[PDB]
């Protein structure tokens, strides 16, 4: 229990004190018991909080704070020209801790290395950002969006069409979040 060597100085407690030896007067002792002084003090604390401002925000009219690093709904991004950023490296499919990404690829009609299938199973994804960290072209990113609850589970099986549409809609946020945090990446 104690470390090896001599006992720590004053580790042994002094002997217990009898009722007779208690250094506290009877009137104080009887008064606290019958008047419940510490319970009254605790109640007084609540009144102090009763007149302090509440912390509540009125969601969805107000929102809590999120950072440029926030990991939400996935999106596929473009270049300013509109070409897809994705070149089917499969780095995000390999690093994915949950095996949520499935990719197929060949040469496009113009001979470019592009995907034919890019699915993310949002009911397998653990929202960790590893794909976004592994992507060498900033193709896969997590948007700040978190309000996309769905009626059916099939609506959470994102294919390439769903993900490229998400990137088209969210691009100004995606660029702003990349703009703020890229120095730290």
């Amino acid at each position: 229990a104690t470390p090896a060597g001599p006992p720590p100085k004053n580790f042994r407690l002094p002997p217990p004190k009898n009722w007779d030896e208690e250094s506290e007067s009877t009137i104080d002792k009887v008064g606290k018991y019958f008047l419940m002084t510490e319970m009254l003090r605790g109640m007084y604390v609540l009144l102090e909080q009763f007149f302090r401002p509440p912390y509540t925000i009125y969601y969805p009219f107000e929102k809590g704070p999120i950072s440029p690093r926030f990991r939400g709904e996935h999106a596929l991004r473009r270049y300013p020209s509109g070409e897809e950023r994705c070149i089917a490296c499969k780095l995000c499919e390999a690093v994915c801790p949950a095996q949520a990404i499935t990719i197929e690829a060949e040469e496009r009609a113009d001979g470019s290395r592009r995907t034919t299938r890019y699915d993310i199973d949002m009911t397998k994804c653990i929202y960790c950002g590893f794909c976004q960290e592994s992507c060498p072209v900033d193709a896969i990113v997590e948007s700040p969006n978190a309000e996309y609850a769905t009626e059916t589970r099939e609506e959470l099986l994102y294919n390439k069409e769903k993900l490229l549409a998400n990137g088209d809609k969210w691009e100004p946020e995606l660029a702003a979040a990349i703009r703020a945090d890229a120095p730290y990446r």
């Binding site: 401002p53 925000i57 009125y58 969805p60 009219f61 107000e62 809590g64």
Partner: protein, 67 residues
Amino acid sequence: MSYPTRTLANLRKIGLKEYFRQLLYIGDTKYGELVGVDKFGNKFYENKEELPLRTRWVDYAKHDYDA
């Protein structure tokens, strides 16, 4: 939790019609400067003297407001 002086002031700055409409959706008496409007018609406001995280808020264009 508005407090009397806050709600009385915002009432004077907004009027009773606006006050009651605001009481019908957000359930508070809020007043601030119009920051802008989005494509859907939502109006966004700022007031830096509000409580933390309550300094920005949206008035939704649609009755069935959704986030």
